[PDB]
Amino acid sequence: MTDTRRRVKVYTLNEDRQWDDRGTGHVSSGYVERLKGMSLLVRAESDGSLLLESKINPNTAYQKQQDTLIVWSEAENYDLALSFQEKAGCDEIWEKICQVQGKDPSVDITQD
Amino acid sequence: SLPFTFKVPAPPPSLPP
Numbered sequence: 837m838t839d840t841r842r843r844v845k846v847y848t849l850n851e852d853r854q855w856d857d858r859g860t861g862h863v864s865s866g867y868v869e870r871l872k873g874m875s876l877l878v879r880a881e882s883d884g885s886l887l888l889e890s891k892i893n894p895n896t897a898y899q900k901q902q903d904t905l906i907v908w909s910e911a912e913n914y915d916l917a918l919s920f921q922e923k924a925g926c927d928e929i930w931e932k933i934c935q936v937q938g939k940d941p942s943v944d945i946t947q948d
Numbered sequence: 949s950l951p952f953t954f955k956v957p958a959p960p961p962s963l964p965p
Contacts, residue, residue, distance in 0.1 A: 845954040855956050907957050919954040 841925045846878055846888055849915035861887050863918060863925070865932045874936050876918070876929065890916060892936040897947035900930055 844863045847855040861878040868875040871891040878888035890910060899907045904920040906929060920926035927941075934941040 847956060849960070853962070854959050860954075901957050902955050905955050905957055915960075917957045919956065921953050 840921045842928070843881075843921040843925070844878060845919045847917040847919065849917075855917065859887060863888075863920075863929055865892070865929070874932065876933075878918070888916070892933055894937055895947065896937075897945055898930075898933050898937075899946075900926070900944045906930060906933070 839862060842862045842864065843860065845860050846858040848858055850856045860881045862881070864877045864879075865874055866877055867873065868877075868889060868891065871889070873894075874892050876888065876890045876892060877886070879885070880887040896908050901907045901917075903923045904926045905917060906920075906926065907915070907917040910916045918926075918929070920929075931941045933939075934943070934946060937946050939946045
């Protein structure tokens, strides 16, 4: 029954500049009132909680580091990554990011 | 079968930013 198309693992860059597993979940996009924009939303698989709510900032350089990884700087000293079970799901979210930023989804980094 | 499901990003170097 578990959806795999949008199933992801969320990572944050830790104090040793390695990656912390913050849990598996499912990723969607939606407009978030207080962030004034389309945002990436992850619900945790462990308990359904809101794990991630990240505005798609027009100026952020998102990187498609592999066919199933999207990586970006959320703030200073704060780096995030979404790892996708399905390349098709990664492509779906990459398209939304590229649409928000006015970029062609063929790029692998959205800002120069 | 796949070995694992979830890739992880590379650990970033200190230099260059």
